[PDB]
Subunit: 270 residues, 6 copies
């Protein structure tokens, strides 16, 4: 568990609800998430929505999901399994709307790249993982939404982060609204979508997805798992991870944390 379904007449919400862990993803959460997604294929409201309870959307993957001992291929298959759970959103017969408020970190920002429609709080924080313990996994899925210059900007600075406004301006989100209006905004869109026959929604979505596929959407994801798994085995990365065995999390993060690229541009008069 750690995931809840809130039914409604226009949109059913899948809600991450692990307050104790800032809605971070575990293997168990993910199994339950996929079970809901599948169940909502033919049950419930005509739109499917995803959001977080509490203070933020999701802090990303629990660090303890990574297991060094199982070897690199087993890591490749684990990471790839995550991408397939997100591709179930893309293949889904209903429109999938993702509502992000507060924090959206790491692999949670990968999930959201596979939504149909993405509405973000103006003040949300969309972030790379805070410590450079991996890579080549999230930002590549942003390329078709934001282009390669911003994807590379996002990826190349440790703990880089943008706000909802910036995510909308880059093209990652459809629109940034005040935090208090995020849910109601999605509900308003869904109430209009509800007037369409579900078969219409489904075929409109399949047909747009073929154009994305033609533009490389699916093949873009074909080696990101390998990329990230290789980095989990670099010695300089296993040493950083070892710092976690001894020291406080905040101290390790603290040696990487600092200005984001957008803060640097603003400071220099952009």
């Amino acid at each position: 568990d750690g995931v809840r379904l809130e039914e409604g007449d226009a949109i059913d919400w899948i809600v991450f609800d692990r307050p104790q862990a800032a809605n971070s993803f575990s293997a168990t959460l993910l199994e339950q998430f996929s079970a809901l997604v599948k169940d909502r294929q033919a049950n419930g409201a005509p739109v499917l929505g995803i959001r977080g309870s509490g203070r933020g959307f999701s802090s990303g993957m629990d660090l303890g999901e990574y297991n060094a001992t199982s070897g690199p291929t087993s890591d490749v298959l684990r990471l790839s399994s995550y991408v397939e759970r997100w591709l179930d959103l893309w293949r889904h017969p209903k429109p999938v709307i993702v509502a992000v408020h507060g924090y959206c970190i790491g692999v949670a920002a990968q999930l959201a790249s596979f939504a149909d429609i993405l509405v973000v709080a103006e003040d949300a924080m969309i972030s790379e993982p805070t410590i450079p313990i991996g890579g080549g996994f999230i930002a590549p899925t942003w390329v078709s939404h934001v282009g390669s210059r911003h994807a590379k900007e996002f990826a190349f600075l440790p703990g880089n982060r943008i706000d909802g406004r910036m995510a909308a301006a880059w093209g990652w989100a459809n629109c940034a609204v005040p935090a208090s209006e995020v849910i109601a905004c999605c509900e308003s869109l869904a109430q209009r979508m509800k007037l369409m026959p579900p078969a219409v929604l489904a075929m409109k979505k399949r047909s747009i997805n073929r154009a994305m596929e033609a533009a490389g959407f699916h093949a873009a994801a074909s080696a990101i798992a390998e990329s990230d798994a290789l980095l989990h085995l670099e010695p300089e990365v296993t040493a950083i991870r070892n710092r976690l065995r001894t020291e406080d999390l905040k101290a390790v993060v603290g040696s990487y944390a600092g200005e984001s690229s957008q803060e640097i541009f603003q400071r220099h008069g952009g």
Copy 2:
């Protein structure tokens, strides 16, 4: 007929001129349109322009072009024939500039996706078809211009619509100008283009088109006809179409019409 050619020294305009039907497309109009496009390959001015007479660019396809009795494949081939007429713009040796004012609805917004340069009136209305009688035909051709988030937003709400400013901001148009300056703006661009040797214009265009093709532009269109033809056969769609046999058009539209997605975002503080 219903289409006119207005020759000029920098740009020849193909002009939709069916006032009685709000410049909507019929089989006859389309044959004449393609004949002009072909004739302008080697005759006339160095730029080709497309625009509407009167109150708007075009209201789209006449409803009566759809014929249930001929079967689905015959519908696929009809729809596909439309896409090929638009691809003639893309393959054309001259720059093709499309000037939109007032309304640009349905299949007319598909046409305009295959222009080289698109100039739109700030106050134009670019719209999906008003009743969800089809789908998976127009928005997929927008993906390479606006991305998948806005294409899906545009597609998933019945009668969704944006203004010229929004179309420019999404990347669908090059620029939005006041309605009174649309034509003169295109003429000004064309007067500069005129200084280039025509062979230069032609090769610059072919070479950019290869990069689009590499990015999936042509393959993106390969099943949109099938998508739309399938929807024309859904029972829930044939029932809506049957409402047309009995009731006033305005009453049927009226049960689908309402706020656009961009109006919803504005209302919620975007």
Copy 3:
């Protein structure tokens, strides 16, 4: 020579420094440029930067690099060799940051399309070649950054040009900053990037590049050389080039120079 390396602790700059020719590219400059790029693969700072000395980034290719007598295939191979030197930036294991101030003309604007991160002076001038002596070479490499409408706009008007602000807004640059802050801005980004292990930077970049490749990035460049080489042989182009044999450069440019597309849009109320 005409290229210099300025080492630093976060970023090493490759600096074009041919004041006598406005940092224009010659065969010799290009050999030295590639030698530096290669040497910086495993030596020096973790980020590689490219910029110009003096008044601007680069005025592009020396006209005298084109040799009519060697035939079209030999021209194809020369032009293609330029593209491969730029692809070495894309394949490079370090982040490559390009800093543009003042002018960035012709083939120099092609180079910059293969950078990872591009920072431009607000007041820089990014320009097509001033006389239509070629084509189908630069703008096709802009398509994945700016879309096909702006690429075609840029290409179809002789000597078309945009400023840094516009280049940022189109998506060609990451950000436009005042001229005096361009270098320091790049240094600030690089100081953050420096905290990442180099293997991380390298794999993040390879993985993003696979997503670009999936979207056609590499295949987009496969015939641009052919396109440009064909145009060098059009009679109307060889006549313009012949005007150079007799007349002042400024007189020939002067018959093509004029308003840019963006100036035309502004004049018409965009």
Copy 4:
């Protein structure tokens, strides 16, 4: 109607519906996929697929098509079949398919997503006997046999080739006598068993990326739509009505005749 036969080099998933010539039903297919998933991390290092009895499979049972659910619901059903086959392609283990006797319709689609395909010399690989659909099976063959043979296969009703032909076209790795098909696959698997499983898995992912770069995944992206459209053509629904109202043999008998390869042979 599916069972698992475990072994030390290869586990076989075995279609076993003698009453229906190993044809596929929604229930069979759910069980098939549950086995494929289970074999991801359990059992032998190779996964095999084959049929019990007289043939591999006669394809979909006709009753899976439901006119009543509408075209999109049909698209989603057909697409769900393709995804079951893509599970083979995504699978961490080599997937070997062994075909004997008949392999008809959608069962010949399934086999296009195997890694290795061993066919009985004798086998009959066939389009559906009656033209009640299309654009679903042959497009998945293009990658293996080229467009010429895929179009030749698709454009004649009940077209069919034997195992030898399938091997020569490139659809099978090799054609062997019926009595050796299983033992041949076990022999291959015994050699594959010497490789670390992680090696097998990665070799397969890397080859799959080269297929994907060559269009493999995108080539399947509208085949469901194509077939569902044809289920609604008036000429197809009239043929379907013949089936509901005359003897199957009479309807088949109206379409049956020489295969393309028999035509080529006859003309030298």
Copy 5:
């Protein structure tokens, strides 16, 4: 120089220019396309293409190249040929091409965009005899024969294969005796006739999407440019000038010799 022979299973478009060995002129090609378009919704369910007399076609007549119009005008002319062939590929009916005797140059490009290709065992499929161009024909073969044979074909002047070889390479579906080429295509068409036309059309569109996903359409996107560039190489214009000023046989005689496959045979 083209005619239509109607039939009940297949209508044949027949090149018939005996005085020029069925070579293509701008006038022939306009008439060819007008027939292809007409046969979209009229006549028999299959469309055939073939040549009358001694061969399929000797290719483009040399006079279609005009140095005077400039390179871009040349690119547009060559590209217009490719679009005429793409009309076959887009066509709602199966397109069967029957080749006997000679099939040279651009006529061997045309035949790459047929659905089904039946060749006389005897036929000669040939690159142009003199190297006056390039990069136009063989790239359209890659999809059918692979890059190795396409490069082997393209890199030797006047390289040529027989029908058997073309079938073994994958360019033809099958090679039969010359006297059976037509009757073979009619036989196939009589079976195809039993399928509803809508079924044929959709089967073909769906297979074409799998080709397109595999690069088929994009593979043609710069072949016009490649060939037009070579029409302007000094070494090519000097060969062309030999043609304007010596006997054709003398110029050909300077390039003619063993084909690649004759070389391989000779070396065992």
Copy 6:
């Protein structure tokens, strides 16, 4: 350990390291690339590659792998090999590869980026004898042989085919007797010599664009990553440790056995 033998139709780059069975070292490879680059605009119109002595090449020497440099450094090393082979593919001259005796591992990757490939009937084309990597060589074959044979090749340890098989699979243009391999390539080159070099160069670029449109370049974009991951699997590092600590023959002897094609033959 590489030399250049100049000729008037073809210049041969010749691997010549008898002490190491023409295996590749970083020094060999730098010299190989310096020759390939030099032959861009110098010498004969065709470039050839071959091995001196008993075989083409045994592949990479094992000492090029350095565990100490980390995985990314390994990815960059493997990728640098692929780029050396892509220089052949980008090269302005036809590149003909002649293989006799053994062609193992990465040497069988190299040969996939030749234009024309002539193999001795006799030759042994082999995966590495011990499974110490993967996902690097076979993915480059898919384009030439299809996914079925590429997977068959990759999934069995030390799998191997002879030249005949390589020709029948499509990896080689043709298999000839060992004593004719060179003279066969010279014969082809003497015909290619009659073509203007500019023609050859453009024919090749245009065919390469059709390959690229079919995925050729993108198919190689993660093979380095795949192989470098497998160099870090515990089961692979244990096999590698056997090599550092037992006789090579004992370790090989644990994996050696029937090839897939021997298995198919044995089963009829």
